[PDB]
Amino acid sequence: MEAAHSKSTEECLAYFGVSETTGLTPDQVKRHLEKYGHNELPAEEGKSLWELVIEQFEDLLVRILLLAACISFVLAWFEEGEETITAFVEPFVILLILIANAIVGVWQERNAENAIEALKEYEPEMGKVYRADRKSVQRIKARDIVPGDIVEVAVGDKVPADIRILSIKSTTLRVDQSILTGESVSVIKHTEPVPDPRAVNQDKKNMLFSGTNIAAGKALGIVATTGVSTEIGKIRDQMAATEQDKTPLQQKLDEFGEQLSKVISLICVAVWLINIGHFNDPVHGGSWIRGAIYYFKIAVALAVAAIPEGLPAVITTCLALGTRRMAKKNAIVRSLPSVETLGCTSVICSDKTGTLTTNQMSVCKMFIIDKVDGDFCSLNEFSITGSTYAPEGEVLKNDKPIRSGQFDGLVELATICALCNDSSLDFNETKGVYEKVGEATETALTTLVEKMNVFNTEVRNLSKVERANACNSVIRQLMKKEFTLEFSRDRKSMSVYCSPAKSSRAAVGNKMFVKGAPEGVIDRCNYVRVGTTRVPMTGPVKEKILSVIKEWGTGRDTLRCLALATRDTPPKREEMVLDDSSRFMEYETDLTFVGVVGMLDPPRKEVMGSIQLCRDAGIRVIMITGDNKGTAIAICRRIGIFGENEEVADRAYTGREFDDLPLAEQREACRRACCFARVEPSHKSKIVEYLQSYDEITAMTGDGVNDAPALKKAEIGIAMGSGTAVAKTASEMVLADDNFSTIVAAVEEGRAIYNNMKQFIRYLISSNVGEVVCIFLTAALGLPEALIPVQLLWVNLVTDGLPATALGFNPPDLDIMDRPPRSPKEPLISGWLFFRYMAIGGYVGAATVGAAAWWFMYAEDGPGVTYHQLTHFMQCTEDHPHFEGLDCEIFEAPEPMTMALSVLVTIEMCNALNSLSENQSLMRMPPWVNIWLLGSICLSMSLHFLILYVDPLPMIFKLKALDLTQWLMVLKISLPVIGLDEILKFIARNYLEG
Numbered sequence: 001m002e003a004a005h006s007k008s009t010e011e012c013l014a015y016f017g018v019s020e021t022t023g024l025t026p027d028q029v030k031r032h033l034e035k036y037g038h039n040e041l042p043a044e045e046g047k048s049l050w051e052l053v054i055e056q057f058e059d060l061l062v063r064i065l066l067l068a069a070c071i072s073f074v075l076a077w078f079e080e081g082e083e084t085i086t087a088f089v090e091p092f093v094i095l096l097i098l099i100a101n102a103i104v105g106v107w108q109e110r111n112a113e114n115a116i117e118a119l120k121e122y123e124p125e126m127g128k129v130y131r132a133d134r135k136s137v138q139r140i141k142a143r144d145i146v147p148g149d150i151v152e153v154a155v156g157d158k159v160p161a162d163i164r165i166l167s168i169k170s171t172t173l174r175v176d177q178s179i180l181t182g183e184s185v186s187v188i189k190h191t192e193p194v195p196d197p198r199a200v201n202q203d204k205k206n207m208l209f210s211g212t213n214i215a216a217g218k219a220l221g222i223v224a225t226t227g228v229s230t231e232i233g234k235i236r237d238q239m240a241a242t243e244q245d246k247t248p249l250q251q252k253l254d255e256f257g258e259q260l261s262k263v264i265s266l267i268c269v270a271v272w273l274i275n276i277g278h279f280n281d282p283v284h285g286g287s288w289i290r291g292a293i294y295y296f297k298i299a300v301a302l303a304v305a306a307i308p309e310g311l312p313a314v315i316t317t318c319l320a321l322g323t324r325r326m327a328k329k330n331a332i333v334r335s336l337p338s339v340e341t342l343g344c345t346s347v348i349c350s351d352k353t354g355t356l357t358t359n360q361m362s363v364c365k366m367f368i369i370d371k372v373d374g375d376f377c378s379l380n381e382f383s384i385t386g387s388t389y390a391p392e393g394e395v396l397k398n399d400k401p402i403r404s405g406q407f408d409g410l411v412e413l414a415t416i417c418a419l420c421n422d423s424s425l426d427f428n429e430t431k432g433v434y435e436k437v438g439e440a441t442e443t444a445l446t447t448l449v450e451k452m453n454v455f456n457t458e459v460r461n462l463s464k465v466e467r468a469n470a471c472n473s474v475i476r477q478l479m480k481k482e483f484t485l486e487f488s489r490d491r492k493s494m495s496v497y498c499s500p501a502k503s504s505r506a507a508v509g510n511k512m513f514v515k516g517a518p519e520g521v522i523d524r525c526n527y528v529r530v531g532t533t534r535v536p537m538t539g540p541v542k543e544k545i546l547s548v549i550k551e552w553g554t555g556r557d558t559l560r561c562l563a564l565a566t567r568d569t570p571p572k573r574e575e576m577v578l579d580d581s582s583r584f585m586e587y588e589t590d591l592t593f594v595g596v597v598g599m600l601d602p603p604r605k606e607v608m609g610s611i612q613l614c615r616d617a618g619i620r621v622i623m624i625t626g627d628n629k630g631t632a633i634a635i636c637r638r639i640g641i642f643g644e645n646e647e648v649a650d651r652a653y654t655g656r657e658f659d660d661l662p663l664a665e666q667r668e669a670c671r672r673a674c675c676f677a678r679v680e681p682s683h684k685s686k687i688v689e690y691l692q693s694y695d696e697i698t699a700m701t702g703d704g705v706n707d708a709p710a711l712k713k714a715e716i717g718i719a720m721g722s723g724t725a726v727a728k729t730a731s732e733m734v735l736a737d738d739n740f741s742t743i744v745a746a747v748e749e750g751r752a753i754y755n756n757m758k759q760f761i762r763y764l765i766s767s768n769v770g771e772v773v774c775i776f777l778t779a780a781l782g783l784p785e786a787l788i789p790v791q792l793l794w795v796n797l798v799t800d801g802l803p804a805t806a807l808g809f810n811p812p813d814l815d816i817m818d819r820p821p822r823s824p825k826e827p828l829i830s831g832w833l834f835f836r837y838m839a840i841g842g843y844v845g846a847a848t849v850g851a852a853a854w855w856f857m858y859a860e861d862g863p864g865v866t867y868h869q870l871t872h873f874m875q876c877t878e879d880h881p882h883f884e885g886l887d888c889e890i891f892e893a894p895e896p897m898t899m900a901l902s903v904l905v906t907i908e909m910c911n912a913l914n915s916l917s918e919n920q921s922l923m924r925m926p927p928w929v930n931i932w933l934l935g936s937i938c939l940s941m942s943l944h945f946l947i948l949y950v951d952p953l954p955m956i957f958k959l960k961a962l963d964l965t966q967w968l969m970v971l972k973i974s975l976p977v978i979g980l981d982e983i984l985k986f987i988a989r990n991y992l993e994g
């Protein structure tokens with residue numbers, strides 16, 4: 001039964017055909033188990049180790065590298081020679097990267113925990129049932145529990161399934177439904193049916209939800225639903241059905257792989273098309289076995305030259321360090337790729353209480369009735385100082401200190417606040433401050449009566465701990481609390497039944513003290529306290545009361561108002577049913593209005609400016625609160641969301657108003673709203689969807705399992721540090737200090753990181769562009785290989801990895817938050833920038849190839865080989881007289897490759913400096929603006945010389961130490977790359993900035 005809350009206890013027992021006294025028969029247990037299944041959320045997909053390794057080879061680029069590893073392995077096999085010490089090195093390194101890449105991918109899934117499995121933390125192992133096969137209670141496995149089962153719970157027990165309460169054996173039953181919401185304040189349950197079939201869980205006062213705890217009491221019930229059909233199971237299904245898209249960077253990177261694959265293939269065809277002329281070569285002569293190895297050697301090199309092998313490592317490093325940085329700013333980011341998404345945040349939906357505000361309640365104002373004389377009326381307004389829970393403050397009338405005891409109305413006022421209260425104070429000796437015990441709202445009343453002191457009790461003589469509950473205890477000794485009628489949202493109030501102390505043999509003198517929302521309470525007030533006297537409630541007076549309430553709540557005070565009334569003649573104790581909470585409003589009628597208290601939940605000191613930062617950054621901020629629409633709007637105006645005098649009729653909605661709109665007007669409302677009050681449980685997810693329908697990168701806050709699907713759906717789900725474990729696991733970021741300002745600080749940091757990420761991404765890919773051209777040129781012209789896979793890998797992983805990493809430490813722009821959010825579809829390289837790297841790559845490709853060609857020709861250490869024979873170097877071993885001179889093995893010399901490599905390295909060191917700013921020249925933004933970058937370049941070169949001198953290394957990379965003259969030639973051809981980019985930057989700054 002999904003609607004068991006609306007059904008009577010007799011109807012639920014009738015439905016399943018079960019006896020409350022005996023329970024389900026063994027046949028019924030069988031039939032119900034087979035029908036509804038076991039009481040458990042389905043097990044997650046057990047991704048095996050082998051299946052996990054395979055996923056690491058599903059990426060397009062790692063498959064290309066895998067293919068390039070195979071050809072390299074085959075070529076390292078089928079070869080003539082005895083020097084295999086530098087043959088199987090190349091295919092082994094490529095394989096090592098793939099394996100190392102596969103190791104990391106497995107290490108992540110090993111440590112990653114999804115929120116769906118975090119929900120299984122809330123399903124207990126055991127559960128107690130009554131079945132017909134036994135007299136006493138039998139504790140069985142909770143998964144074996146079925147709908148229709150008669151279950152028993154007690155204090156400490158974790159509720160095994162969604163249960164319709166049948167009988168409460170103890171006096172009262174308190175349940176901790178904190179895993180659903182955030183308020184750990186235990187709620188009271190009953191057995192009477194809840195009329196509304198479409199009632200929310202908060203109002204289902206006769207249900208026990210799977211996962212919650214019995215704070216107090218012991219009761220018997222019948223299982224309504226199990227497994228995924230429970231409230232927590234229905235949430236699990238929503239999360240499982242929620243499909244989270246990849247971050248914009250991941251979508252661009254994936255796009256990059258798709259296109260890099262095409263290019264790689266295209267080039268291969270191009271190389272073949274250029275060498276079509278080999279079809280006109282005689283079949284007799286030459287070597288088709290050496291001609292094939294050449295075309296396969298350059299193929300392997302082409303792949304390695306294309307893939308930014310070091311990029312996924314550099315990205316991860318930047319994010320991990322940024323995460324550590326954000327952690328110090330109270331922002332705990334859980335997913336590394338979410339850092340980018342965080343910087344693209346266009347809309348931030350934050351809860352008010354605890355985040356936008358301090359959740360530190362404090363009574364600021366209050367008023368009683370001073371005089372009612374016909375059409376004439378006067379109130380007595382007061383003000384209270386001190387915003388802390390400490391009993392340190394005074395009461396003022398017109399800014400003048402007054403004694404509360406001199407007002408009879410205020411004595412009754414304080415009496416209500418002390419007795420109609422389930423909270424208290426406690427001075428912490430460890431911290432040294434007064435902390436709250438219970439609800440923040442009720443505790444604010446506890447603090448108030450300590451400041452008022454209507455009886456002028458000697459409180460300056462007491463200690464610090466005894467000072468906490470002083471004036472309260474004085475009032476408690478006056479009236480004896482018989483019982484309390486709990487709060488309920490249907491009547492929005494609570495009350496306490498009290499009898500006088502000195503009254504052992506009497507039945508006359510009882511009083512009821514009511515508190516709650518002003519509207520409902522005042523409507524039930526037929527009388528008015530004027531000091532000790534009482535007058536009938538009249539029109540003009542009632543309006544005078546409601547007006548001030550409207551002013552305090554909707555004004556710049558933004559106060560939450562509570563109405564306090566007393567029932568002078570409460571119904572007889574015997575004529576009251578304390579189990580039927582439906583009759584409570586009736587019990588709280590014919591009241592006498594005493595006064596109204598106004599309390600403030602002050603906004604954080606940093607929220608005001610943080611909101612403004614968002615306005616500057618084009619980030620819309622939406623408030624979600626429990627306040628009424630009027631107060632909600634007022635608080636928005638106070639914190640700067642709304643202009644103090646701007647129209648907001650179409651920018652603020654209640655949950656009910658939002659439901660009354662058609663689906664078309666709902667989507668429209670979300671694109672312009674900034675304030676949601678009294679929101680219904682399903683609305684957070686709905687709002688996110690609508691925001692996503694406008695392609696908004698949405699941030700969303702929450703702290704309970706109720707908000708879990710919304711947190712998972714939003715691009716950046718945000719959880720509170722004081723929040724639940726499931727909410728945290730369902731989020732992308734955790735606010736350690738629960739502060740809204742932490743969010744904004746995180747977004748700014750998110751922008752700074754991605755800007756630097758744009759740099760080393762474009763820097764590394766730019767290098768790969770130049771490398772490919774080098775491989776293409778050396779294949780098109782038919783030149784000996786200038787750069788080999790082993791060398792290119794060292795560059796892309798180490799030599800260029802260090803400057804790339806350093807580019808992630810580039811100083812952020814000063815106008816970071818003075819710019820609109822970045823469009824997710826904004827490409828990393830396009831337009832004139834595409835042309836720049838198109839030119840730079842062409843330069844690098846020519847410089848590296850040219851440097852190798854320079855050694856074969858116009859070099860002293862090199863031969864006098866002409867161009868015509870350098871392109872036909874594969875024919876020197878056969879057609880000797882055509883190229884008579886030196887040995888044919890000189891075409892495999894290590895010197896020209898070192899010249900190419902050193903040029904590649906040097907240029908990329910220069911291009912790293914060119915990557916400090918996109919358009920700003922080095923004359924405007926010097927290289928020493930980034931000290932980390934300069935240090936990285938020094939290290940990269942030190943590692944370059946490392947593999948040039950340390951004997952085991954230059955053999956592996958096929959390198960030889962360059963002469964001073966040769967090194968000069970490297971600088972002659974490398975350094976002017978700065979001038980080239982400088983010109984291109986100059987063209988961008990003066991002929992494109994429109």
Ligand SMILES: C/C=C(/C)C(=O)O[C@H]1C(C)=C2[C@H]([C@@H]1OC(=O)CCCCCCC)[C@@](C)(OC(C)=O)C[C@H](OC(=O)CCC)[C@@]1(O)[C@H]2OC(=O)[C@@]1(C)O
Pocket residue numbers: 252253255256259260261263267270305306307761765766768769770772773776827828829830833834835837838
């Ligand atoms: C490693 C070497 C090059 C070949 C390369 O990256 O491939 C291209 C390709 C994949 C794109 C291009 C490259 O285009 C070429 O260089 C083609 C010329 C071929 C010359 C050879 C002679 C026959 C990028 C690299 O060119 C330069 C000019 O910047 C820019 C950009 O890249 C980005 O925006 C960064 C990716 C996150 C992408 O156009 C990108 O694909 C698109 O989806 C984007 C948006 O990605």
Ligand code: NA
Pocket residue numbers: 244710711712713714715716717730731732
């Ligand atoms: Na999410």
